[PDB]
UniProtKB/Swiss-Prot annotation, chain A:
Subunit structure, as described in the record: Heterotrimer of 3 chains: alpha (C8A), beta (C8B) and gamma (C8G); the alpha and gamma chains are disulfide bonded. Component of the membrane attack complex (MAC), composed of complement C5b, C6, C7, C8A, C8B, C8G and multiple copies of the pore-forming subunit C9.
Gene: C8G
UniProt note on regulation of activity: Membrane attack complex (MAC) assembly is inhibited by CD59, thereby protecting self-cells from damage during complement activation. MAC assembly is also inhibited by clusterin (CLU) chaperones that inhibit polymerization of C9.
Entire protein: shown range: 33 to 200 of 202
Entry GO CC: blood microparticle; extracellular exosome; extracellular region; membrane attack complex; plasma membrane
Keywords, ordered alphabetically: Complement alternate pathway, Complement pathway, Cytolysis, Disulfide bond, Immunity, Innate immunity, Membrane, Membrane attack complex, Pyrrolidone carboxylic acid, Retinol-binding, Secreted, Signal, Target cell membrane, Target membrane
GO molecular function: retinol binding
GO biological process, one term: killing of cells of another organism
Protein name: Complement component C8 gamma chain
Family under the similarity heading: Belongs to the calycin superfamily. Lipocalin family.
Residue pairs linked by disulfide bridges in the UniProt entry: 64-156
UniProtKB/Swiss-Prot annotation, chain B:
Localization, UniProt: Secreted; Target cell membrane
Assembly notes: Heterotrimer of 3 chains: alpha (C8A), beta (C8B) and gamma (C8G); the alpha and gamma chains are disulfide bonded. Component of the membrane attack complex (MAC), composed of complement C5b, C6, C7, C8A, C8B, C8G and multiple copies of the pore-forming subunit C9.
Native organism: Homo sapiens (Human)
Coiled coil: none
Family of the protein in this entry: Belongs to the complement C6/C7/C8/C9 family.
Disease: Complement component 8 deficiency, 1: A rare defect of the complement classical pathway associated with susceptibility to severe recurrent infections, predominantly by Neisseria gonorrhoeae or Neisseria meningitidis.
Record protein name field: Complement component C8 alpha chain
Gene designation: C8A
Function of the protein: Component of the membrane attack complex (MAC), a multiprotein complex activated by the complement cascade, which inserts into a target cell membrane and forms a pore, leading to target cell membrane rupture and cell lysis. The MAC is initiated by proteolytic cleavage of C5 into complement C5b in response to the classical, alternative, lectin and GZMK complement pathways. The complement pathways consist in a cascade of proteins that leads to phagocytosis and breakdown of pathogens and signaling that strengthens the adaptive immune system.
Length: 168, 49
C-alpha cells in the first residue's frame, strides 16, 4: 500500500446507497488513449456487513451492464481487497476521504498501479470538493493530463438478468 | 472443449454414450488451431474503469 489511510472511523452504513462517478485520475492509459467513450458510471453500494456489495452500472455501447463486486473487507476499517478475482489481481481499495451525504474519494491500488476516483451523491460536485480531489491527485503524483472527467448524463440503473456480469 | 464428447462410442440399443473410441487428445505432431468464435468474454477492471 502507498502512504494512504482510510477515512477515520469509516461507516459502511452511511457510505451505502448510490454514488455517481465524477472523475478518475489514473496512470491507466486506457483512459489516456480513447478516454472518450467512457460512459457515465454509477455505483450502487450496500453493506455486505464487513464487505460492501458494489454494483457498478454502465451503458456498454448502450447496453446497461451491472457489475456486482464484493469490496471484501481487508481487516482494516475502510480498506478492501476485491477478492483478487483473476489475473486482474487483488485491487486494494481505500475510502480515503468522504462526507457520506455528498461526496467520497476512493483510492484503488494495484501492483505498480494507483488510481483515485471522485464520487458524488449528486451532480455537479462542489468546487471545493473538486479542487480537494485535484490536490489528492497531486499528492498521488499524477498530472492534470491523467485526470479524466466522466459525463454527467445517461446513468443506467437496472441492468437486466443477462447484462449482469456478477464478478463477485 | 467437447471434442472428447464426439470421440465416445455409442450404444444404439441404449443410445448411451460409451467409452472413448477415438483418442480425443492425441495431436500426432499436428499444430492445428480452431478459431473460438465466442472467445469474446466480457471483463471489468475497476482500476481503469
Amino acid at each position: 500500500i502507498s502512504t494512504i489511510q482510510p477515512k477515520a472511523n469509516f461507516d459502511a452504513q452511511q457510505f451505502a446507497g448510490t454514488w455517481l462517478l465524477v472523475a478518475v485520475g489514473s496512470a491507466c492509459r486506457f483512459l489516456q488513449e480513447q478516454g472518450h467513450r467512457a460512459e457515465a458510471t454509477t455505483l450502487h453500494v450496500a453493506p455486505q456487513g464487513t464487505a460492501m456489495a458494489v454494483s457498478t452500472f454502465r451503458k456498454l455501447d448502450g447496453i446497461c451492464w451491472q457489475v456486482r463486486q464484493l469490496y471484501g473487507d481487508t481487516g482494516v476499517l475502510g480498506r478492501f481487497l476485491l477478492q483478487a478475482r483473476d489475473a486482474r489481481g487483488a485491487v486494494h481499495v481505500v475510502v480515503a476521504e468522504t462526507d457520506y451525504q455528498s461526496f467520497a474519494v476512493l483510492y484503488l491500488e494495484r501492483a505498480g498501479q494507483l488510481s483515485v476516483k471522485l464520487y458524488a451523491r449528486s451532480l455537479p460536485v462542489s468546487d471545493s470538493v473538486l479542487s480537494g480531489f485535484e490536490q489528492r491527485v497531486q499528492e498521488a503524483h499524477l498530472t492534470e493530463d491523467q485526470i479524466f472527467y466522466f459525463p454527467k448524463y445517461g446513468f443506467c440503473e437496472a441492468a437486466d438478468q443477462f447484462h449482469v456480469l456478477d464478478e463477485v | 472443449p467437447g471434442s472428447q464428447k464426439a470421440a465416445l462410442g455409442y450404444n444404439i440399443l441404449t443410445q448411451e454414450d460409451a467409452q472413448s473410441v477415438y483418442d480425443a487428445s492425441y495431436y500426432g505432431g499436428q499444430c492445428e488451431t480452431v478459431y473460438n468464435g465466442e472467445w469474446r468474454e466480457l471483463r471489468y477492471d475497476s482500476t481503469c474503469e
